[PDB]
Design a protein around this ligand. Structure first.
Ligand SMILES: CNC(=O)CCS(=O)(=O)N1CCN(c2ccc3nncn3n2)CC1
Ligand SMILES: CNC(=O)CCS(=O)(=O)N1CCN(c2ccc3nncn3n2)CC1
Lengths: 220, 222
């Protein structure tokens, strides 16, 4: 039986909200956010990981275009193949495409594998969030309502399953019986609920939130 | 590692005739039914072309697909799961255009119980899956002039990228004159390449993104 509500912030597995700026690196923030929780579960250390390392190094060979978009799964595969990702501290975020400056001397995390959840299954996503950790997802954020969101459970009638924005599901619950996904965004601490959006849950895969979920894992 | 050096699923009667998608970007749909066709043959002993048009018309907005304007092999598989079936090509023929969903369970020729996405860019994992499970849905970069003009041998395009735009089916692998290849069934009719097939470079750094996004469906016992 799954818990009615989950929040990975209460378990000390979620870093401060970041600000992607004018660089379309949401995919990179989504991927490091998921791995940050698994690093905390593995080492007891909460460490922001380097989104810039993914933008600069997980490039053409991973089907990624840095500030012009990419994939959380191919980010995870890069971390696998690369045998690490640097700390945000050692490889900070500049909101630009740069030459790969990865250095193994600044490795903060590894990744052994990743798992893609089945298309559109909100019950499978609930299990994964309860049982495994925060989950990288794509949502359709290409509606003005997403940008103007301030508080409560987000529902956009024009929302589609054509997802274009990488974010991190860090929990779920209900607001007076209105069910939501708790979503960490990468638009800084002033966006929505101090960087978070509660997106309608069990509403026919609303904005494609359960379209393409994935989570990484660390060996041991 | 421990796989056969060559595979060709046409030797097992698991591959249908090459199809012609025409002026409709339904390669995703052809890729998906092609993979499921092999699994249907392995399960029931019968080779039956399945309805790419059924996917175009029915596996739509909900599945992140745009019919003649592109889609995904995985969300196609998910549609066949959710729908509990896919009609035969014969009952629901291909028109190279977007139509209203006309799926009818009276003409169901296959089901799907699950699908599997392979890890990004791992040609050894793709080899195992092709040997051990059957044909595999993949995306390739088919944007380069050289691809349209391919006639024979092993295709290697230095300008190829991992930006894939075209859904096709890996039906085998091997080596020709000291070049390792993937055997790829295309959906541009039998005038294209080797009666509708292209041999694409294998173990050449994930050439044209062939191993970028592989997937295969399965059919369970009940
Ligand atoms: C600039 N914006 C971005 O970089 C965001 C990209 S995203 O989060 O919107 N999303 C990532 C995952 N993706 C798929 C697609 C098919 C699939 N089949 N299996 C997995 N996937 N993943 C779709 C796009
Ligand atoms: C008109 N053209 C088409 O319809 C062809 C589309 S495709 O075959 O080129 N290809 C399908 C698989 N797709 C992904 C992407 C991300 C991902 N992450 N995980 C799995 N995927 N799969 C990429 C696109």
């Amino acid at each position: 039986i799954l818990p009615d509500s989950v929040d990975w912030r209460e378990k000390g597995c979620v870093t401060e909200v970041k600000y992607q700026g004018s660089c379309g690196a949401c995919w990179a923030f989504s991927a490091v956010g998921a791995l940050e929780a698994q690093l905390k579960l593995k080492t007891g250390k909460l460490v922001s990981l380097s989104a810039q390392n993914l933008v600069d190094c997980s490039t053409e060979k991973y089907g990624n275009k840095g500030c012009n978009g990419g994939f959380m799964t191919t980010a995870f595969q890069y971390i696998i193949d690369n045998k690490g990702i640097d700390s945000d501290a050692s490889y900070p975020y500049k909101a630009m495409d740069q030459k790969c400056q990865y250095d193994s001397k600044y490795r903060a995390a590894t990744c052994s594998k990743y798992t893609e959840l089945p298309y559109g299954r909100e019950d499978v996503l609930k299990e994964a969030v309860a049982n495994k950790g925060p989950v990288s997802v794509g949502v359709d954020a290409r509606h003005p309502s997403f940008f103007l969101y301030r508080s409560g459970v987000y529902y956009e009638p024009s929302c589609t399953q054509n997802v274009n924005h990488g974010v991190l599901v860090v929990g779920y619950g209900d607001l007076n019986g209105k069910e939501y996904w708790l979503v960490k965004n990468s638009w800084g601490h002033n966006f929505g609920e101090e960087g978070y959006i509660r997106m309608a849950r069990n509403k026919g895969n609303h904005c494609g939130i359960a379209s393409f979920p994935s989570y990484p894992e660390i060996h041991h």
